[PDB]
């Protein structure tokens, strides 16, 4: 019945792209109307910080409040493996709740990116699928996108990362395009962002014979 805490990591792209700002989110649900006051204590490697910000309080319309505190983290602080502890104190709580998150521990491994053309059997259909194999990477935090002629291709689907037998992760991304676009020689590119890549980025291109 009492409040519960959910501590969330930053989005992979936010930590991988220097032009973005990564942040950890401490979410508290089941906050009673009687005692909506929530005290936040933030810690980085055991050292308390004070630059956190409280999001607007929210009614969940099931007679509870949703109190959220956000802490901006540095790109390399997160990439080096610093742990972020969120301590939530409430008077409807017997003891304050502590949650700790960080980047998944383990040596970072560079993803291998290979593109596959559509089968000639698939050339009889209205649309063809371009495949992007990304394997042998760790941690599982990754961003995979498609593009063509400086413009993003949004008609794709990507499987979740799958734990391989060697301890690394792999996945597949499938971009589906009109066959005519493939026959006309247009070049399509598979973008992969990962911390173990050079400049957190690589690109593999693929086109017709």
């Amino acid at each position: 019945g009492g409040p519960s805490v959910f501590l969330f990591p930053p989005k992979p792209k936010d930590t991988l792209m220097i032009s973005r700002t990564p942040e950890v989110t401490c979410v508290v649900v089941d906050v009673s109307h009687e005692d909506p006051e929530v005290k936040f204590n933030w810690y980085v490697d055991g050292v308390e910080v004070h630059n956190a910000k409280t999001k607007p309080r929210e009614e969940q319309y099931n007679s509870t409040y949703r109190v959220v505190s956000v802490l901006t983290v540095l790109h390399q602080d997160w990439l080096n493996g610093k742990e972020y502890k969120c301590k939530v104190s409430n008077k409807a709580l017997p003891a304050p709740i502590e949650k700790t998150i960080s980047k998944a521990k383990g040596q970072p491994r560079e993803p291998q990116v290979y593109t596959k053309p559509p089968s000639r059997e698939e050339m009889t259909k209205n649309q063809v699928s371009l495949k992007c194999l990304v394997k042998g990477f760790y941690p599982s935090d990754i961003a995979v996108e498609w593009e063509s002629n400086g413009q993003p291709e949004n008609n794709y689907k990507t499987t979740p990362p799958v734990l391989d037998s060697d301890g690394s992760f792999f996945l597949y991304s499938k971009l589906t395009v009109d066959k005519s676009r493939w026959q006309q020689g247009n070049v399509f590119s598979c973008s992969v962002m990962h911390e173990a890549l050079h400049n957190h980025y690589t690109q593999k291109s693929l086109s017709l014979s």
């Binding site: 792209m17 220097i18 032009s19 400086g150 413009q151 993003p152 400049n199 957190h200």
Partner: peptide
């Protein structure tokens, strides 16, 4: 050198 993604700066070493 640096890496770019659709105009947005990714990372530089």
């Amino acid at each position: 050198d640096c890496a770019w993604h659709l105009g947005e700066l990714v990372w530089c070493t």
